[PDB]
Structure 1
């Protein structure tokens, strides 16, 4: 049913499959300790995972996969998908990362957790990169879907859907009035950022499943299982 859909139908489906922007735990106290910082992030990410899972099942072609394949893809891409969400939300907040509408953080708070500020800078640069490119919402949901399907594909069906999203991405740029040259260039620019998102995920992951970051805050069972999938090995 995914391959049969058109470009505008693809966009419409992805736009309406979008998860909500969840809030952090209220009562502020700007997270100055690494315990409170990790606490808020872990809690937030854990709640987002539930929405992400139901978001994935509403992505055209994902349901058509076996349950085993669905698990593998989500295991590989879950931090990537959280990150591209974060940088997308943080576009109109330069110099700051909008984890939640009630949780806006700068790089200074990134120093609260030992070794997290390196990745905050990368996230801020990615959000900044997206800003100057004037990344549209229709392109973002295309990029996020690509991350889900591509990051664990290494299967003719998946690549058939990946091509369909590519057709969709170009269709958006064509409508925006970009010339053919501006179309391949922008498409290339967007996909190269996915490599950086992968990089941030891997560097972030190896900290997250480290024994030090596992002991700072009691992690949920689900989040712990999503980490364990990457902890093979190090």
Structure 2
């Protein structure tokens, strides 16, 4: 029951993703070097990991069928509030339940609880973040479901500041019904079981993590000496 429009949408988003997610993580070199030794020793590197991921997410968002029909101001609001969430989602690709870490290439760009810890976020965030990663991993989404979920997350009507929330909703709906339908036609049981509802629930887990993140961001950034270790894009996106 996948219409030709819906196969189109999934074609676009797979390609959009492929163009914005290099699975060899080769650019991780242009990032300030990582340091594991250690008072916020990681902050410069991961700050650069996030800033970069921000860029890549924007690049994915622009190709979302319908995102272009939005105003520049609504495009702004949606990206500003989804950015970290979409980074958590896309990060699932490098995360592995082997040692509960994000394994990008190897060691020097393999990140873990104590690594993440050493960048200035507490365990009030990191513990539930990892939990999230474990549950999202276990759903074993089809990559098509992966990219549909990232796009659905970006195009959320309820984000504070939205104007044409109505046209935001229509673009999201088109993507939702595309996901609901894909799961039925392409996801075989038992994996298919309540899969959509379990994905929409990850969106709610994401809001909670974001809220925690936005609180501990205000914390790092109230100390200029920390704010001074970030990138300008991170400053601009996470509110300045």
Say yes or no: TM over 0.5: yes
1:91 Cα deviation (Å)? Answer: 4.0
- Deviation string for 1:168-199 (max 9, x for gaps)? 212222222348xx55x211111111111111
Distance in 2 of aligned mates of 1:93 and 1:61? 38
Query: Are positions 1:13 and 2:12 aligned together?
Result: yes
Tell me how far 1:78 sits from its aligned partner: 1.0
Question: SS at the partner of 1:52?
Answer: helix
Structure 1's unaligned 5+ residue stretches are 230-234
Q: 2:92 matched to 1:82?
A: no
2:203 paired residue number: 194
How far apart are 1:5 and its partner, in Å? 6.3
Q: 1:139 aligns with which of 145, 151, 167?
A: 145
Alpha-carbon contact 1:33-1:112 (below 8 Å) kept? yes
Structure 1 residues 147 and 32, CA gap change in structure 2 (3 angstroms): farther
Going from structure 1 to structure 2, the CA distance change for 1:53 and 1:41 (only over 3 Å counts) comes to same
- Comparing 147-156 and 217-226, the one that deviates more: 147-156
The answer to whether the aligner puts 1:24 opposite 2:28 as a matched pair is: yes
How many matched pairs? 224
Q: Which residue number in structure 2 is paired with residue 203 of structure 1?
A: 212
Identify the residue that residue 231 of structure 2 maps to in structure 1: 220
- Root-mean-square deviation (CA, aligned residues, Å) is 2.8
SS at match of 1:6: helix
Counterparts of 2:34 and 2:54, CA distance in 1: 25
**Following superposition of structure 1 onto structure 2, how do residues 45-194 of structure 1 map, counting pairs within 5 Å?**
45-91=50-96, 93-98=98-103, 102-150=108-156, 152=159, 155-174=165-184, 175-178=186-189, 182=192, 185-194=194-203
- Return the alpha-carbon distance in structure 2 between the equivalents of residues 8 and 213 of structure 1: 48
Q: Give 5+ residue unaligned stretches, structure 2.
A: none
Q: Quick check: 2:43–2:120 contact (8 Å CA) kept in 1? A: no
Q: TM-score w.r.t. structure 1 length?
A: 0.82
123-132 vs 8-17, greater mean Cα deviation: 123-132
Question: How far off is 1:115 after superposition?
Answer: 4.1
The secondary structure found in structure 2 opposite 1:135 is coil
Alpha-carbon displacement from aligned partner over 1:185-218 (angstroms, at most 9, x marks no partner): 2111111111111111121122123235653252
